[model samples]
Target: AQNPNCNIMIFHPTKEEFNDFDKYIAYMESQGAHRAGLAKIIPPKEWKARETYDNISEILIATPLQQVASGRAGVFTQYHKKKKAMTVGEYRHLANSKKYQTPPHQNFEDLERKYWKNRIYNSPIYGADISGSLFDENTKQWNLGHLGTIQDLLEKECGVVIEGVNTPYLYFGMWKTTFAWHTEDMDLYSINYLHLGEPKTWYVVPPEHGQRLERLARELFPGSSRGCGAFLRHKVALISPTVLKENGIPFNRITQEAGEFMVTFPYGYHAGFNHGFNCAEAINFATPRWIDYGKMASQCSCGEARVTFSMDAFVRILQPERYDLWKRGQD
Candidate 1:
């Protein structure tokens, strides 16, 4: 028989209430916060200079990369694009062949085998060719819209999402660039959900108080290449649920189901957790983006005022900053 009372009212806290961090921390610990981590508080009203935003699903839902952009210059994209139309054996040969190469910034040997171990997946952000074979004028413009998509998705899916005051579009290749401890652009708000693994150490502080944490990470690991970008204290929320001990002790442990979400809030100083293993796939799906909420907010906000990347924001945000970069590849 179908049980009509199967539904349950989960006790989820609001953004403002969540800000009472001490209480939330206590609650988490009491709940056996085995996966100790932090989340952000959604804001009541917009405070950024610009109100640009986009849905993250647009970037994720469809194939991660445009066919043409994949093979061009990026790491996984370039390698995967060439083998896109190849057979399983041929693909494997190609993947392991000398012709296929990884960019200096993206060395998969260390983390690839471990993270995507046994699983074969490529980044979808680029075109189909690893050698930059397929080029298109429109692909570049089409990709910029993804930044908005990522921001929008985060707001819709996560607990407390914040936008940056002076930020327009999230810089592409920020994560693709050289390794270094950096922060997200602007003083945006962020949150990280530790679903599977436990996080041993985390760095969180406001602009004034958090400056020290930012300096420390950079000074110690200037070229550590940890954060997404090389920004300073734009907020770096780390999550690793498997690190928590049953008796409430701190120890780095690995778990199959361990997952984490790191959201960067503007002016929030933070960095990645020092987990021994590479990030798990769960982190990608832990907080899948919800387009409905983003679409509603963007449409509503667009009607109210002039915002840059708001759901209804302009497409100008997609324009490339340097013509040379755009010309390097066809797309």
Candidate 2:
């Protein structure tokens, strides 16, 4: 919670820059934008709201009513989790309650393992899943189906569909609702768009520090880490920025507001929480430069059973000459 002056990169791309988003993003990354691990892109002022969420505001969604064990109010470090069903509006009303806004353990880490199992309590509404099920033609331009010169190339080029990767996932979050530390499935690039409402705070570590964080995570929870690499993938861990800083893990803090897009570079370990009621849609996309990260991921032992997209299959879909070139790490 004590993040001192390190801020991620931010870009205000022009019409030309926004039109060819791929070139712009690539240009930024090539110039070392990747060091920040994530960046924010703000389009020209004339751009209007994305029409996608407006059409499905009334659809049913799965909401995770969360309990906070961490000292921070918004951070989720629950021992047990559960999902409740309701329309988007219904959850919003529940999220607005005054009691849910103020966490009982705002000053201390309250839940001990001895009492964790027997003390499951309902606290905040963290309605997180909004992927694939709600799709329509109106939102195609900003939707996962389209966008970026190189983002989402796996689906656009190969006729393959991976929910939350190629197709966007919707999320409804309120004060204290959050997501934990993790990377994209195949070290792919991830983009999150906040359609309407309050801002989402993000914490990120560059790809190089990913392993260090993993090691620290294992030590922090030896029993859980023994399960598999899924230890972090399980998405239950919540280490505050202050703790991460104390351990010498470099990080940055940034806020993503409405009508804006935040891009998490491949292998960037990020976790965040919402400030208040808001709807966000996020998806994973791959730039040509991602092939290297994907290759690196394939070589890691812990990544074997992840059930992610196949790098071999991904290469097979490239054009003819490109295949052999890709074998030599090209095209």
Candidate 3:
């Protein structure tokens, strides 16, 4: 019998070590931590960026409401597509309000309950180049962008600008709102930093079983993959771990807390929800390790969310240019 929860590999890098964070991540990648598809790094209490939460807590924004569903056996989060505009301050109050006033739903068979909720996700940091914002370059100590393992080579080298892809975005997690199972754009790696608040839980499928998880998703939700090949890439589908383990797909559980960093590997599927009101910043990045995976990915058959790019763009242009820079030992 397997354990109920799989442990996500954890690292404790002192403040000085975190200064050379990219090096640490690269070292971990070399050590085969990527095989787990996800790793957690805990930072010190002196992060010096409380302003990230202090400034963002009162901003005005439009946040999507997630209609949460859960049970004794567990349930998948359903995106209601019902967006509402309000101050983040007001949202904090409502989200932190009493939730168990009465029966959320009448469904007693699965014991699944549903409630209207909102989570601030992918909210841009209100800066053009991810600078001059609440969480900016000055926070270089924990700057998610400076972490080289999953650094955005496309933007750094190719001069491309994709907001959430290359720039950091804030996530406000309140209770049960979740990010469904999905891989990163262009199959690149992703790093998330929990600024503060309640812990977040992530369940991920490793790179080896990546395809197996997709197969399971297609079998369970035949309608999703039947007509749409890139259904999983949409990042909307959710399957409980209970079903996944029963079907033979291995998984790991990561309980991320304040001041910790979570790095996900290429082509690995990950999903999670907030334990309570919390804030995090995340960005997509690519090292040469991701070039192969990017080649395997075509445009999302899901939608026109991101403009498409092919492998030749990287091979014909990026590789030789990077090699030339390497010879000169420069960026």
Candidate 4:
């Protein structure tokens, strides 16, 4: 995959910027963040990891809903359409084998996709109750109205033109449970605002930053290592409803708002896990941008420019610093 003429930025909201629950929700709603309906409390008292996994899979299976809203096939099907879907264990065996030095293919795109697909399938589901043996008896009701309202706001306010998807509601359970540390195939940008519950979150670095970090990780762990370990570049800017006061230095009068936080990633590696008694829920969206090989290599002998992959590069060269954030008409 070709690297994009990468440009990314982070926007941090002040406490004053998000004072009311409705106001904060409005801001996130504008950013394409969909509010998941009222979710059941997760990490139920004394929950075990195995129990969590079982519940998550059960929840996903219960909906019988395919991962992609595309309605054609599941996300895994789309991924398999490109490259054969293989387990992480299988891939690792291939990577560590003496038969190959870099990957079988020099393209990191293949390896990255493999890693992402596995991560999603293996993620633990939370929020909905899938613990009991009977599906109908234990299933929890969700607030889908809130989710629909959010999608409507995104289309009307933010101008995020998603095609073929109608009224994108909560497909996957939100704050269904704490997401264990993992990475996805696509880029994610989101803002978490605590309304009824407050959960602590530690932001990780974005992927662009990972480029620098990977170098460091390789040097530190040369043998049997994955992409360079620069995960910090994906760090998130924390926000919440519980405001904190800036007592010293820069200005003593500064007061921070709680229950609201905004984290953006043009690309990079990052992870979020729940941290509190309450189940963690937030508005999140993933935008998958293809990588342009021509510009990334500047020497690819491939014919007929890879149109989808090259767009990010065009956006970067023409408009730096906010390629992804630039709404089309503004350009």
lDDT of 1 by residue, 1-331 (tens): 2212211111245545434433543453344321212232222232121222222212211122211212111111112222133222332233334433232333323432232221123232221111111112243211111223344445455443544322222211111111112333222233332222212133333332344444443443344324322323221112112211222322222211122233332333333222221111111111131232222111111121222333211111222242233223212
- TM-score, per-candidate, Cα-based: 0.26, 0.74, 0.74, 0.29
Model 1 stretches with alpha carbons more than 4 Å out: 1-180, 193-201, 213-264, 274-331
TM-score sort, best first: 2, 3, 4, 1
Which is the better candidate, 1 or 4, if ranked by lDDT? 4
User: Candidate 4, after superposition: displacement of residue 90 in Å?
Assistant: 37
**Candidate 3's residue-wise lDDT over 120-209, tens digit each?**
222111111122123566787867655553224665655653333235666665666667788886677888877777677888988867
Clashes of 2: 3
State the displacement of the C-alpha of residue 102, model 3, in Å, after optimal TM-score superposition. 14
Which candidate order results from sorting by lDDT in descending order? 2, 3, 4, 1
Alpha-carbon RMSD to native, per candidate:
17.2, 7.9, 8.6, 17.2
Q: What is the lDDT of residue 64 in candidate 1?
A: 21
lDDT of 2 at 236: 70
Return the top candidate by lDDT: 2
lDDT of 2 by residue, 18-37 (tens): 66657877877765777778
Estimate the TM-score for candidate 3. 0.74
